[PDB]
Symmetry: D3
Subunit: 279 residues, 6 copies
Amino acid sequence: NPFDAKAWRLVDGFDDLTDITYHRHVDDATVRVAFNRPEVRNAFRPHTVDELYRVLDHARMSPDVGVVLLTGNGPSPKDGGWAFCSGGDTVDVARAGRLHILEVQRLIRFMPKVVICLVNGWAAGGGHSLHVVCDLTLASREYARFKQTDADVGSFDGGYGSAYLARQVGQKFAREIFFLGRTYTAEQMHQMGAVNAVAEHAELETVGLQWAAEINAKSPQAQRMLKFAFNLLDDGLVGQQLFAGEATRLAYMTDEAVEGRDAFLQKRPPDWSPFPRYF
Amino acid sequence: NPFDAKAWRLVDGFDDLTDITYHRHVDDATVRVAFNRPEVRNAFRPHTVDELYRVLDHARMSPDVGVVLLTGNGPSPKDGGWAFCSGGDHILEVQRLIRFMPKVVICLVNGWAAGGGHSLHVVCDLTLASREYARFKQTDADVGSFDGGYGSAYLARQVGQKFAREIFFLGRTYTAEQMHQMGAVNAVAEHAELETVGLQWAAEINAKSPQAQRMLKFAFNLLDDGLVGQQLFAGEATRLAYMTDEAVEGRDAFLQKRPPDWSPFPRYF
Amino acid sequence: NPFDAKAWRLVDGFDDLTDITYHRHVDDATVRVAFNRPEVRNAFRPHTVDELYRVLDHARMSPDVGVVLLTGNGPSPKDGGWAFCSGGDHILEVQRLIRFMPKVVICLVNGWAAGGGHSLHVVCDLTLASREYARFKQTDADVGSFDGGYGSAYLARQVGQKFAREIFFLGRTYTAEQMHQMGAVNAVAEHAELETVGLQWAAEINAKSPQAQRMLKFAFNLLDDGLVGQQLFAGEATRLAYMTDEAVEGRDAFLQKRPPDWSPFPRYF
Amino acid sequence: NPFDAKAWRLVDGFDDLTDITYHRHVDDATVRVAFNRPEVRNAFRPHTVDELYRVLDHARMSPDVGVVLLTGNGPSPKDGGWAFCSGGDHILEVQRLIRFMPKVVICLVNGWAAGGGHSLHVVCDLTLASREYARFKQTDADVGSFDGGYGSAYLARQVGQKFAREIFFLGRTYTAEQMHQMGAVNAVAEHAELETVGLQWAAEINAKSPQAQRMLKFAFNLLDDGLVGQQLFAGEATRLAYMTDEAVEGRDAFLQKRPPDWSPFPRYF
Amino acid sequence: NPFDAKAWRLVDGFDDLTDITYHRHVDDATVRVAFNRPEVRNAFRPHTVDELYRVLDHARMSPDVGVVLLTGNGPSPKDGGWAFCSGGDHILEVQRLIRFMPKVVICLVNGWAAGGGHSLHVVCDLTLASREYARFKQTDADVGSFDGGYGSAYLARQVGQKFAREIFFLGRTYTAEQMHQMGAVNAVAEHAELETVGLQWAAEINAKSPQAQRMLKFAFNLLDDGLVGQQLFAGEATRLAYMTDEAVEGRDAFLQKRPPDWSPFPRYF
Amino acid sequence: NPFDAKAWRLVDGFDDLTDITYHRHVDDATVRVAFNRPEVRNAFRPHTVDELYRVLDHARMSPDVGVVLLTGNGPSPKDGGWAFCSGGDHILEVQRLIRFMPKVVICLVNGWAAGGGHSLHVVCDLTLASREYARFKQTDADVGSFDGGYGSAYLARQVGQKFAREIFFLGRTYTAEQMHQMGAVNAVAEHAELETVGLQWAAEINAKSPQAQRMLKFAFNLLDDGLVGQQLFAGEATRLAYMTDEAVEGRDAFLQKRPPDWSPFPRYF
């Protein structure tokens, strides 16, 4: 099993979770968020999505977490098979039909932390789309299976799952993945450019933690700017908003800005003299 | 006073609000969300942002609400002045909430709209402004701050690049009529009638197909917001497909385990 | 020879074709569109482009066709050589017809794909290539020409900016396997099996929801094609909307001269 | 009446048009394409769109025509009303034809421009409007429809995002002067002089270098149209390159079976 | 005459300028760069462009200069006419220099702004125009040239796509006030007061945080300028981060060959 | 040692160079520009960047130079090891000069390419790498730095978003062959043959039409670089136009004080 209990501690306040598990590493600034319905191939129901959203939002707001590992628990009790995520499982009509998984994609995209998907088995439909939006993907050599099946049922992910996949594997390969909906292995998707590295199944989370540790070893501020720099143009004004918001925060810390805030409350004319027009 | 108390009821469940008020119209599919710190020119402190986010997010999830009027309460009990929102005393999360919600948000600028408050007006779908009292000022750079996101770059998609750069670089105060001429204010209203007019705009939006309005909003956001724009618009497109006979057939043929039959459905061109 | 005559039937109405052949599969929603000048390495002349347009335009409007296989006939009777298309002896219009048609176009590169013929493979949705015989060469710059549109800039969205630049600046010849490594060729097939593989690909495409397939192609085009990409994708959203109960009510309330009742139709979020 | 019968001749080969008229100016490089269903406020049925496409495509390919005036015939014989085009009774193909044609297309809005007809005016390069009778109205969402393409997103590139949102979300009627203030109408003309003014603007356009006007149109389309926009502009650049002595040297050498001498042609910067 | 000799001193090191003048205000962090060929309507020859480049580059690299005033000297000694710049008697390099310099460049259009002269005004951050004498004309296409770059596409980001296309396609002469209405001119000033107003605008820009103004300009440029816009904005961000405690530590560790300690620096969200 | 002394001559007028070397090839239109501080792993100090900018700008202005080979001298005289460029001990200006120059720049990564040195390789048009000694490592975030421009966002347009994020966030060291597989290195060469191979690629580039190569490089930049990319590409197209009969006519007419006759020049479609 990829899961090594000795590396993980439950996060306080999440005793009520049924469809997701959430652990913090014993030492490292890393959390493990996982689908916890292996008996149904880790398909998500609206309750799952609510919990996933809650847990990732909590991880986003934890100042002592730099890396989220997103994965699926397993294996299945009914068949021994392995799944990361196999996709989706008048007032209330509206609130039922929530596009909640889309809100979860944006939370992954926008959070100032590196999210690594660890693909431990089937990554199908909305599950495949979740792997696509994560910053990095590591995959199980033996059991990772990628398959974009949406169009078999007349559905499609016309957003991050398709258009952003073309910015990883190129337009020819991403069209093939969607138009034919074939099943690919970890090594096939690594060769195309959507999986970063392939790991032995039992060592997938071990590799995920080495990756997280190398990320957490660098300047957190730099890692934040880099993720938003990578999102920026592809995300248009939203991209610029997140990236400029981090630049605004940086500026606030400077002597110049401290001068400027001084002046306003003190009530005098700000003094820009000390601060050159850099070029 | 633009506020007509008789028109509005408090939304249940928000008795602990201190910095924001939140009403639903007595008859219309319209809510009124307002800054409630008039003695401090409606500046937001972190608690105000928490509350604003909570109220708008509830508004977003209210299936019977079509339009959000976002405004400030007044006048100031200190100097009798008028403020929509004077900026900072999390606000990016609220900007994205306004931008992504599948409902039209109209800012009713009833007074000063400065700094962060000016940026909030810019990211709203529509803006109506008090002729007498709306004042637009982007002051950020006085204290060495800047909104380098929707407050500036998106403003330039309203008034064009020369006017947007003037607004930020000089930090002058602008009237409702000035901003209407430049293209950032949709209309000017008599101060006392600002909310009456807002309600009339809301009623006109609410009279059209809600499906179509939601699609148009995301269509206007789409390219400017890149893949996020695409994600929201395509998301609604996925919803529309879900409803079709084709997707029904697709879902049925999956469970009654069999090959789907697409022969009844053209390859439209 | 990749061509299996038993799988194909001539399309009615095209007896006069001289430079292109056009067949429909005996069973599948697939057509075969081929350069028919192997004596001249399948170079296109003006009349060739005209015919290729009419044929692809017909394929676009055929509601029982989901996939186009685009290839070159062969071998050359002069020298036994193999060519998909070697470029010009109007082609921009044919690129846009491939790009915008609501069906998956697969290029089967059975031989040289050079200059213009290289750019046609690039703009196709997918490419399969003959292991033994496909030869990819962008020679535009030798003769002072350039495809500064889809053949270059879109190629960079398949193989990345370093490779696409190499391909054009140096004009070297690449095998199917090389172009597969780089990302411009989806798969390599044995020469004799290229069309058999293309048909298996086409069958897998046509076994899915045609609606979802059309939506996905326009989703992949969207942002890269700017307002044109949004026009095609949103044009399909409009079509989906028209089918809904909401629009039906919208439309009837207009005809019956009453105010629309949107009340049964929730404000989705 | 804006139409001056003496100024125009029927274009040859269109004796079978019923829903559109197509004239060429007596002296100028200018055509007049007009909706011809005034009894029905110039709404388009599928046959109208077929004809409109055929006509505009013929004008695109007419090398002696520089400018298309696109307008609406009237008045209505039923009530005396004036209509440019009131929208739907393929139109996306017409929009790309106007967008992509290497000629300036001026919309002369002589009356109502509603729904799809409003979107046609938006996609034209320039719009002149009848002071007295132009009415701009974007009604789509009333019937649960929407133009999520050029008619909305591209309108926002003319009047800015706040006004474009306003126009669609409320569906109010606007006068020529209002749209001229907002930046969607270039100029307002006396009703009776609309075509006269149109022809004067056409003549000023036709007096300049046609190759330059072509490049400038494609320059204005380019970045908004993503890869399509790049394809059309680069396509014109390719054409310019083909004319150069450098290009000649490369073409000569190819057929002359020798290696080219780039010696004469310097390395610009 | 808008030039006030008493306000300006020559910049040291520039005695050899013949085609441009370059002054620094006696008191303010503002420079005056101006075309100095009034006898030929301030048309630029290659030597003019060399000098213009050298001067603006100097201004860019002058840390005590916050704002550049770019204008035209006059009147003409021949006819008493007034010209900002009438264009081409390398300019793309100057355009980029204006565009990328981390300082506000205000164009003061005191006279004719035609051809490349019009395009320079368009690329400046802000434009102030002489009420009586500013004339804006885009003439390129008369002689078969075009600015398909900032002069045309970026103008559409100020005035909208309809007005920008009119401006180029007809090549009419516009007044200061017409350009102001359309959105390409920020403000109109009495001719004699043009440089006084420009100094006042400069002083209001120079009164705010220079770092905020730098960032804002690159935020305005960013998405329009793609990866270049990103490069400039992110480069400023990189400069900010270098100053922080966190970066100081990172730097310490490397040089001291020890492992950095990030614990003091929180994961901001 | 990749450097073949017999192949290269010093360029006149750069005798004062300390941190960079500059050679022109004895026969070919290719220059060699190289970091010359192998004792400090070719790290650049500000003086190095000044010299690099100056040399590259000279090459950009040399009309008899088509290709720039950008590399690092060595080995280190202290430890026998090899570096292309280890980054910092102005560099954004150098990245832009490489990006915007109308010549192909090939980085020859003959050793460590780290930090700013890695980002220089990334912005080059092509990269060839030493099998045995090339080591690519993006170390920025180790000391709290980042290239948020071309070094990161443009790397993603070569190797794709997953790979670029890995390269930055983990900062691992990669080989030539690993980077070739990812898409950022065009080809791998035996170490002592790196420049021999670089010269062969240069010769293949220099044997095509220099005008086509220039337009190609700007086509590849265009959309990614927004309005800057359009400015550059449109700039070339304006040059092409200046050459035509139509533009010669427009010029003559204006000189001869007569109307232009555009009569002989068709409206191409």
